[PDB]
């Protein structure tokens, strides 16, 4: 069963701005997804202090970067808190706690797209480089779910079976044809060193077979 939803109007507008604005400094998408993964790891770390059983789904707190040249995908995986089905729809489909409104106003008043992470919507910078984004997530309180969107104002949610994660979130970027530099080991290393060198969890860059 696949459920299809419309993004809240302002999120669709935000996504269109990211896709259509001429803006060359696209590499910042990676810092933004790593920062979200770091935040999700801080959350599970904190919850586990009072309830150690929340780590029964995995004690390791880390971030993995997985390029795949054959599939033309870059995946950012974390063992963070993850999202229930309700969290997934709310967080990715609506303004929720984000600064979506402030960001679009800021862009009209001198801000630039690299400042997206100051507004709680850094995830959407994935659309600078990806034609489609799939988000696989597993929270201790729910089953595993797959969210997906190629923009256009809609997204889908379905249960995800056959490749269960212990806990966390996997953001799969189906790269645009002209954005394959983000699959190169040297490029990813350069971006991590430039923008994510102080993250408080191990970031492992996988090698291709």
Ligand X SMILES: NC(=O)CCCSc1nc(N)nc(-c2c(Cl)cc3c4c(cccc24)COC3)n1
Binding site for ligand X (CB under 6 A): 36-37, 39-40, 43, 78, 80-83, 87, 91-92, 98, 120-121, 123, 135, 169, 171
Residue 22 or 198 having the CB closest to ligand X: 198
Query: What's the closest the beta carbon of residue 37 comes to ligand X, in angstroms?
Result: 4
- Rounded to the nearest 10 degrees, the angle between the axes of helix 9-20 and helix 100-108 is 40
* 3-state SS, residue 36: helix
Distance CA 31, CA 183 (A): 15
Query: What's the closest the beta carbon of residue 184 comes to ligand X, in angstroms?
Result: 23
Query: What's the closest the beta carbon of residue 156 comes to ligand X, in angstroms?
Result: 15
Do residues 86 and 100 make contact, with C-beta atoms less than 8 angstroms apart? Answer: no
Number of CB atoms found within 10 A of residue 97's CB: 9
Query: What's the closest the beta carbon of residue 77 comes to ligand X, in angstroms?
Result: 9
Q: Residue 5 annotated as binding?
A: no
Exposure of 74 in the CB half-sphere (CA atoms within 13 A): 24
The encoded tokens of residue 183 equal 């699959």
Give 118-121's long-range contacts (Cβ < 8 A, gap of 24+): 121/14
Do residues 67 and 74 make contact, with C-beta atoms less than 8 angstroms apart? Answer: yes
Query: What's the closest the beta carbon of residue 161 comes to ligand X, in angstroms?
Result: 20
Which residues carry a binding-site annotation for ATP?
Answer: 36, 78, 97, 123
């Amino acid at each position: 069963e696949v459920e299809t939803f419309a993004f809240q109007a302002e999120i669709a507008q935000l996504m269109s701005l990211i896709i259509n604005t001429f803006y060359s400094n696209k590499e910042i998408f990676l810092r933004e997804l790593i920062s979200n993964s770091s935040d999700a790891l801080d959350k599970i770390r904190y919850e586990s202090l009072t309830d150690p059983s929340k780590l029964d789904s995995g004690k390791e707190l880390h971030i993995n970067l997985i390029p795949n040249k054959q599939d033309r995908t870059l995946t950012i995986v974390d063992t963070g808190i993850g999202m229930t089905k309700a969290d997934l729809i709310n967080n990715l489909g609506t303004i929720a706690k984000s600064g979506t409104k402030a960001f679009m106003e800021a862009l009209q008043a001198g801000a630039d797209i690299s400042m997206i992470g100051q507004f709680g919507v850094g995830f959407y910078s994935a659309y600078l480089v990806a034609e489609k984004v799939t988000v696989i997530t597993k929270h201790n309180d729910d089953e595993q779910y797959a969210w997906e969107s190629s923009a256009g104002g809609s997204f889908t949610v379905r249960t995800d079976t056959g490749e269960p994660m212990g806990r966390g979130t996997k953001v799969i970027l189906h790269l645009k044809e002209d954005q394959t530099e983000y699959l190169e080991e040297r490029r990813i290393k350069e971006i991590v060193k430039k923008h994510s060198q102080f993250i408080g969890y191990p970031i492992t860059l996988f090698v291709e077979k």
